[PDB]
Design a protein around this ligand. Structure first.
Ligand SMILES: Nc1ncnc2c1ncn2[C@@H]1O[C@H](COP(=O)(O)OP(=O)(O)O)[C@@H](O)[C@H]1O
Length: 237
């Protein structure tokens, strides 16, 4: 399904530190694409880090399809939950290994995923093709991550926006797929550019470790709240 629910959630990265994020309660419906916006330090990455249970729950809990992730095997928990970082690091070695470390797919199915993210041609161009070792641009590495997210049968796609200048063709293919191959996939897009979540149907606005406001960009723009302030600073409104 990919339906996530934070219920009064907070996490700390280390015992001695204060809660990085606290009292976060929200329900993401299965298959939804929700943008997550906020300033640096607001708590956007912590939500994904709480989902992946990188940091354990300090308060409340998270539930994925009615199952408390607190009671879900970590490998299981993380198997169909995929994250696309800003600057993905290829695991040193075979390209195929990066795409399929567990070797649970056939070269056939891997090439499909690549062609899905429109990297089949690039990969075919590569010196070792699938066996190509690691180069590829940050945008391409993200796409490769997207193809891997497909192979994983991912139902929760956490996407991290590149803080660096966005490749015009990567953005074109990335959006091209989010509504088609990840249509049924829940997509948490953690955005560092407010413009990127404007077409989103729903945005969580993170603020100093707490959910500040929720709803569509139009709703949040009308509220003239933190979301609205970020749009002004961004020059969108
Ligand atoms: N590795 C870390 N160790 C300790 N504190 C952290 C770490 N990463 C983030 N934080 C803190 O937790 C809070 C939440 O930030 P974060 O979740 O990273 O939001 P964002 O994704 O918007 O940067 C911030 O105050 C941040 O400084």
């Amino acid at each position: 399904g990919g339906q996530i629910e934070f219920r009064d959630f907070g996490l700390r990265y280390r015992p001695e530190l204060p809660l990085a994020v606290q009292g976060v309660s929200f329900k993401i419906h299965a298959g939804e694409k929700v943008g997550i916006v906020g300033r640096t330090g607001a708590g956007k990455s912590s939500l994904a880090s709480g989902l992946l249970r990188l940091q354990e729950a300090a308060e409340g809990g998270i539930w994925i399809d009615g199952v408390p992730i607190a009671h879900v095997g970590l490998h299981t928990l993380r198997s169909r939950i995929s994250i696309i970082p800003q600057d993905p690091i290829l695991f040193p070695g075979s390209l195929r290994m990066n795409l399929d470390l567990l070797q649970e797919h056939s070269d056939e199915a891997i090439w499909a995923a690549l062609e899905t993210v429109q990297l089949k041609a690039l990969v075919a161009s590569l010196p070792g093709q699938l066996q190509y070792k690691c180069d590829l641009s940050v945008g391409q590495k993200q796409l490769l991550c997207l193809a891997r997210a497909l192979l994983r049968k991912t139902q929760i796609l956490i996407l991290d926006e590149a803080t660096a200048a966005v490749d015009p063709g990567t953005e074109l293919q990335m959006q091209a797929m989010l509504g088609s191959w990840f249509a049924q996939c829940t997509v948490l897009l953690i955005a560092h550019r407010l413009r990127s979540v404007m077409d989103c149907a729903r945005v969580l606005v993170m603020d100093k470790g707490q959910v500040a406001e929720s709803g569509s960009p139009a709703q949040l723009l009308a509220q003239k709240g933190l979301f609205y302030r970020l749009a002004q600073e961004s020059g969108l409104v």
